């Protein structure tokens, strides 16, 4: 079993990405919520099966004292932002630092730009996201939980190198 924690500002798409991967579905009528959740899934890689334990967190500032417990013992950490929201992107550094403080080098980190189906509303370029990821040597991906685009490769890459 490997603990994968999802971090990021409220409403960027953490719950939706997780749902998309778990049941390959999307709630088009889903109106943002506050809460935490745990879900695990087994992925079969051309090397053997890998059990993943996904932690869906609550990123609002009022829950900051819970961050250490979110990240503790994690094998991987996904920092998610919204490509249409500049402020959610500016906060990625904060989340990446929380990860480094708590786990140092013993964790795989991935930076994800979500909501790629709203390209017309993009406020953060792919370039910017990629540079941030390169600054901290993390993985970089842009996804769309709504359309269900480029999400499976994210979990496959994490489950493979970990
Ligand atoms: N257009 C679009 N909306 C999305 C996408 N992912 C999530 N959303 C919507 O954005 C809102 C916030 O998503 P949610 O998963 O609750 O965010 P969380 O706070 O990170 O868990 C919801 O109303 C979702 O339906 C996406 O890829 N595209
Ligand atoms: Mg959520």
Task: Select from 5, 11, 14 the residue to mutate for testing ligand 1; criterion: most ligand atoms less than 8 Å from CB.
Answer: 11
Atom of ligand 1 at shortest distance to CA of 114?
27
Atom of ligand 1 at shortest distance to CA of 145?
27
Report the CATH number that the domain containing residue 47 is assigned in CATH: 3.40.50.300
What is the C-alpha to C-alpha distance for residues 119 and 35, in angstroms, rounded to an integer? Answer: 28
What is the C-alpha to C-alpha distance for residues 100 and 79, in angstroms, rounded to an integer? Answer: 12
How many folded domains does the chain comprise? 1
E-strand ranges in 46-107 read 48-56, 76-82
What is the C-alpha to C-alpha distance for residues 134 and 144, in angstroms, rounded to an integer? Answer: 22
Closest CA to 154 of 14, 35, 47, 27: 14
Give residue 160's Cα distance to chain centre: 16
Intra-chain end-to-end CA distance of the chain, in Å? 11
Pull the structure tokens for residue 107.
């964790």
**Determination method here?**
X-ray
Q: How far is the CA of 46 from the centre of ligand 2 (A)?
A: 32
For ligand 1, atom 8, name the residue with the nearest CA: 13
Domain assignment of residue 110, given as a range: 1-162
């Amino acid at each position: 079993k490997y603990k994968l924690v999802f971090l990021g500002e409220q409403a960027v798409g953490k719950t939706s990405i997780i749902t998309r991967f778990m049941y390959d579905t999307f709630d088009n009528n889903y109106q943002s919520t506050i809460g935490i959740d745990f879900l695990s899934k087994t992925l079969y890689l051309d090397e053997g099966p890998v059990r993943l334990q996904l932690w869906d967190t609550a990123g609002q500032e009022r829950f900051r004292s819970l961050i250490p417990s979110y990240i503790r013992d994690s094998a991987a950490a996904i920092v998610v932002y919204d490509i249409t929201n500049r402020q959610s992107f500016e906060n990625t550094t904060k989340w990446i630092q929380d990860i480094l403080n708590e786990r140092g080098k013993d964790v795989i980190i991935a930076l994800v730009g979500n909501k790629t189906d709203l390209g017309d509303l993009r406020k953060v370029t792919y370039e910017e996201g990629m540079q941030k990821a390169q600054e901290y040597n993390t993985m970089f991906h842009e996804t769309s939980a709504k359309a269900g685009h480029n999400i499976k490769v994210l979990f496959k890459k994490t489950a493979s190198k970990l």
